[PDB]
Each structure stands twice: as C-alpha cells, then as structure tokens.
Amino acid sequence: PVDQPVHNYMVKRIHKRSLSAAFAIASEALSLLSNTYVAATEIDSSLRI
Amino acid sequence: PVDQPVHNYMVKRIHKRSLSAAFAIASEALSLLSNTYVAATEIDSSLRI
Numbered sequence: 001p002v003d004q005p006v007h008n009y010m011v012k013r014i015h016k017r018s019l020s021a022a023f024a025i026a027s028e029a030l031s032l033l034s035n036t037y038v039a040a041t042e043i044d045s046s047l048r049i
Numbered sequence: 050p051v052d053q054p055v056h057n058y059m060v061k062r063i064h065k066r067s068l069s070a071a072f073a074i075a076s077e078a079l080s081l082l083s084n085t086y087v088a089a090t091e092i093d094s095s096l097r098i
Contacts, residue, residue, distance in 0.1 A: 003071040 036048040084092035 001071065004073060005071075 032043075032047060035043040039048070081092075081097060085097040088097070
C-alpha cells in the first residue's frame with residue numbers, strides 16, 4: 001500500500017503578435033476610382049480596368 | 050538388430066504469479082454515486098456525468 005495515482009495540470013500564457021504593412025495609393029488612382037464606383041455610360045472602361 | 054525407438058516424457062511445474070494495484074475513491078464521489086444509482090427526476094445529471 002504505497003501507490004497512488006498522480007495528475008499534473010499545466011497552464012500556458014498566450015503571448016501576442018500582430019501584422020502590419022505599407023500600401024500607398026496615388027491621387028489619380030483614387031480619382032478614377034471615384035467615377036468607376038458609380039460606373040455608368042461614362043467612365044472609360046479600359047482605363048477603369 | 051540393436052536399434053529401438055526411445056521416448057521422452059517431460060512434465061512441467063506451472064509456477065504462480067498475481068496482480069495488484071491501488072485505486073482510491075473520495076467520499077463525495079460515493080455520495081453523488083448514491084443518487085445516480087437511483088437516477089430519477091432529482092440528482093443533477095451534469096454533475097453525475
């Protein structure tokens with residue numbers, strides 16, 4: 001009579017990371033963007049695409 | 050005329066072993082056991098399971 005089961009309870013810390021990157025836009029691209037957002041009979045399809 | 054068959058009869062002792070292990074139980078487990086042995090409308094199913 002010397003034996004007895006034993007259990008272990010380990011717990012962990014989660015830590016923490018992130019993400020980030022650079023992505024720049026030209027103003028003329030935004031201008032052609034604005035018309036294409038309301039795509040209609042106007043707005044040159046070739047330049048928009 | 051000198052040849053003759055010969056036989057050998059070996060017999061074995063079977064020896065003897067056994068097994069034993071420890072397994073403890075808490076009184077609260079037995080108490081919740083008692084209600085589950087008579088499982089009815091009472092006796093919390095979640096705690097019993």
